[PDB]
Amino acid sequence: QRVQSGKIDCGNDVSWAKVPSDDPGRDNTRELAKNITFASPYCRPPVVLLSITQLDVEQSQNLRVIARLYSVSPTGFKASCYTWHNTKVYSMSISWISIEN
Amino acid sequence: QRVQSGKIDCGNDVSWAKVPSDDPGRDNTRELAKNITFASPYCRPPVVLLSITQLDVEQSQNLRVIARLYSVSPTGFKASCYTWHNTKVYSMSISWISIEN
Numbered sequence: 186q187r188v189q190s191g192k193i194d195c196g197n198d199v200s201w202a203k204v205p206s207d208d209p210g211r212d213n214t215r216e217l218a219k220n221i222t223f224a225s226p227y228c229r230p231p232v233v234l235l236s237i238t239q240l241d242v243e244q245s246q247n248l249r250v251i252a253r254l255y256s257v258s259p260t261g262f263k264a265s266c267y268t269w270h271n272t273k274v275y276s277m278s279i280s281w282i283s284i285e286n
Numbered sequence: 287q288r289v290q291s292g293k294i295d296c297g298n299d300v301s302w303a304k305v306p307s308d309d310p311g312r313d314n315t316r317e318l319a320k321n322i323t324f325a326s327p328y329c330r331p332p333v334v335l336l337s338i339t340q341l342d343v344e345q346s347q348n349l350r351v352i353a354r355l356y357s358v359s360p361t362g363f364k365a366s367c368y369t370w371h372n373t374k375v376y377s378m379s380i381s382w383i384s385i386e387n
């Protein structure tokens with residue numbers, strides 16, 4: 186079926202946004218969220234899978250990363266690179282595939 | 287006996303030095319160390335007591351502070367304001383007294 190793919194480059198976390206934490210055991214929650222628009226819209230939300238295909242993380246603090254999928258519409262999806270506490274992310278990229286349901 | 291007093295103002299931790307940690311359970315150890323010279327030297331090392339008399343610390347991370355006394359000579363002493371991990375110190379001051387032994 187209609188299969189589409191792309192890659193989100195989140196870059197250095199200095200440019201990421203503070204976001205409220207959804208977990209009281211995590212603080213300093215930060216993310217680079219993007220609304221991705223499909224090159225060809227679907228009529229119904231496709232299945233999207235995310236894959237972390239680049240990481241550059243500081244060794245002196247724990248590695249803490251999430252590739253978050255927030256929502257999928259027929260025309261796009263919202264995803265983020267997400268970290269917390271004292272992790273330092275110098276780069277992170279998320280490869281993705283969408284497949285008609 | 288000859289009693290002397292003063293106050294060390296360490297200021298904002300952005301200007302503090304990274305120092306090697308003396309405790310594997312502490313990282314990001316940082317300090318503002320000063321070599322204090324007594325206005326009137328002693329012939330023997332006096333007793334020095336340190337007191338933390340100013341603190342301005344960020345509430346979003348734990349408060350972690352030490353007023354460290356490293357050494358005392360007849361002519362002075364070495365002390366520091368010391369913090370670690372993700373504590374943010376905006377100001378810290380150490381009042382001190384020296385008393386002939």
Ligand SMILES: *[C@@H]1O[C@H](CO)[C@@H](O[C@@H]2O[C@H](CO)[C@@H](O[C@@H]3O[C@H](CO)[C@@H](O)[C@H](O)[C@@H]3O)[C@H](O)[C@H]2NC(C)=O)[C@H](O[C@@H]2O[C@@H](C)[C@@H](O[C@@H]3O[C@H](CO)[C@H](O)[C@H](O)[C@H]3O[C@@H]3O[C@@H](C)[C@@H](O)[C@@H](O)[C@@H]3O)[C@@H](O)[C@@H]2O)[C@H]1NC(C)=O
Nearest residue numbers: 190191192193194195196236237238239276278279280281
């Ligand atoms: C203008 O449009 C072109 C496409 O027509 C685009 O270039 C293409 O970018 C793709 C990523 O979106 C890249 O595909 C990837 O390649 C990876 C392997 O290299 C794979 O793992 C991925 O799966 C994916 O397939 C294409 O190869 C690339 N095509 C061509 C013909 O270049 C432009 O994107 C921007 O420029 C790209 C060259 C690339 O930048 C380079 O990234 C590398 C490391 O990834 C490195 O940082 C380079 O220094 C950097 O290029 C330099 O800096 C950029 C900003 C520009 O000034 C370049 O001319 C420099 O050489 C990509 O990441 C960039 O977004 C796109 N935009 C611009 C401004 O040209």
Ligand SMILES: *[C@@H]1O[C@H](CO)[C@@H](O[C@@H]2O[C@H](CO)[C@@H](O[C@@H]3O[C@H](CO)[C@@H](O)[C@H](O)[C@@H]3O)[C@H](O)[C@H]2NC(C)=O)[C@H](O[C@@H]2O[C@@H](C)[C@@H](O[C@@H]3O[C@H](CO)[C@H](O)[C@H](O)[C@H]3O[C@@H]3O[C@@H](C)[C@@H](O)[C@@H](O)[C@@H]3O)[C@@H](O)[C@@H]2O)[C@H]1NC(C)=O
Nearest residue numbers: 201202203204205215216217218219220221255263264265
């Ligand atoms: C991707 O697209 C979505 C919509 O589909 C968009 O989110 C929507 O943003 C609307 C503003 O454009 C917002 O409506 C407003 O809501 C106000 C009350 O909250 C009203 O007064 C206004 O009249 C207006 O109606 C929608 O509620 C919102 N919808 C949803 C479902 O979220 C994205 O916009 C970006 O993310 C939004 C959540 C929001 O960011 C948040 O802003 C608040 C304070 O306003 C705060 O700073 C939050 O911390 C911030 O969210 C976090 O940071 C952003 C940058 C992302 O990383 C979020 O995931 C984090 O939680 C909005 O201002 C942002 O532009 C849009 N873009 C992205 C990158 O997701």
Ligand SMILES: *[C@@H]1O[C@H](CO)[C@@H](O[C@@H]2O[C@H](CO)[C@@H](O[C@@H]3O[C@H](CO)[C@@H](O)[C@H](O)[C@@H]3O)[C@H](O)[C@H]2NC(C)=O)[C@H](O[C@@H]2O[C@@H](C)[C@@H](O[C@@H]3O[C@H](CO)[C@H](O)[C@H](O)[C@H]3O[C@@H]3O[C@@H](C)[C@@H](O)[C@@H](O)[C@@H]3O)[C@@H](O)[C@@H]2O)[C@H]1NC(C)=O
Nearest residue numbers: 291292293294295296297337338339340377379380381382
């Ligand atoms: C030049 O020498 C004078 C002394 O002759 C010195 O001023 C004295 O500083 C003492 C601290 O070393 C201070 O004693 C303390 O007072 C505290 C209560 O206020 C007590 O808790 C302490 O126990 C201790 O006793 C004296 O009061 C003070 N004396 C006088 C006559 O001023 C200069 O030090 C520098 O200036 C001081 C005025 C002071 O700076 C001020 O600090 C306060 C908050 O503490 C605040 O930040 C003010 O804005 C700041 O003053 C302003 O900025 C400074 C940098 C100068 O530009 C001042 O003219 C401004 O008003 C002290 O901390 C400073 O180091 C000393 N050096 C200079 C450059 O004048």
Ligand SMILES: *[C@@H]1O[C@H](CO)[C@@H](O[C@@H]2O[C@H](CO)[C@@H](O[C@@H]3O[C@H](CO)[C@@H](O)[C@H](O)[C@@H]3O)[C@H](O)[C@H]2NC(C)=O)[C@H](O[C@@H]2O[C@@H](C)[C@@H](O[C@@H]3O[C@H](CO)[C@H](O)[C@H](O)[C@H]3O[C@@H]3O[C@@H](C)[C@@H](O)[C@@H](O)[C@@H]3O)[C@@H](O)[C@@H]2O)[C@H]1NC(C)=O
Nearest residue numbers: 302303304305306316317318319320321322356364365366
């Ligand atoms: C207060 O006075 C003491 C001396 O009584 C002084 O410490 C001495 O500094 C000497 C350099 O001036 C050093 O001698 C050198 O040692 C080298 C080998 O290590 C030789 O190649 C040289 O030929 C020369 O002999 C002495 O070993 C040293 N003595 C002691 C007992 O410490 C203070 O200087 C400051 O602190 C020193 C410890 C040192 O700082 C350290 O430098 C190393 C790499 O050189 C590294 O960056 C450390 O992280 C750093 O120490 C930390 O940061 C400093 C700023 C303080 O916060 C320390 O407590 C931390 O551990 C020296 O370079 C510094 O100027 C002097 N001043 C202060 C503020 O304490």
Ligand SMILES: CC(=O)N[C@@H]1[C@@H](O)[C@@H](O)[C@@H](CO)O[C@@H]1O
Nearest residue numbers: 209210211212213247249269270
């Ligand atoms: C407060 C906060 O974010 N705490 C984090 C916790 O969530 C977890 O990531 C842990 C191990 O890496 O490191 C810290 O304790």
Ligand SMILES: CC(=O)N[C@@H]1[C@@H](O)[C@@H](O)[C@@H](CO)O[C@@H]1O
Nearest residue numbers: 310311312313314348350370371
């Ligand atoms: C690695 C490191 O510095 N860890 C610190 C630990 O030393 C202690 O201060 C604790 C409670 O505040 O917070 C962190 O876990």
Ligand code: NA
Nearest residue numbers: 243244245246
């Ligand atoms: Na490590």
Ligand code: NA
Nearest residue numbers: 344345346347
């Ligand atoms: Na608090």
Ligand SMILES: [Zn+2]
Nearest residue numbers: 270271371372
């Ligand atoms: Zn921690």
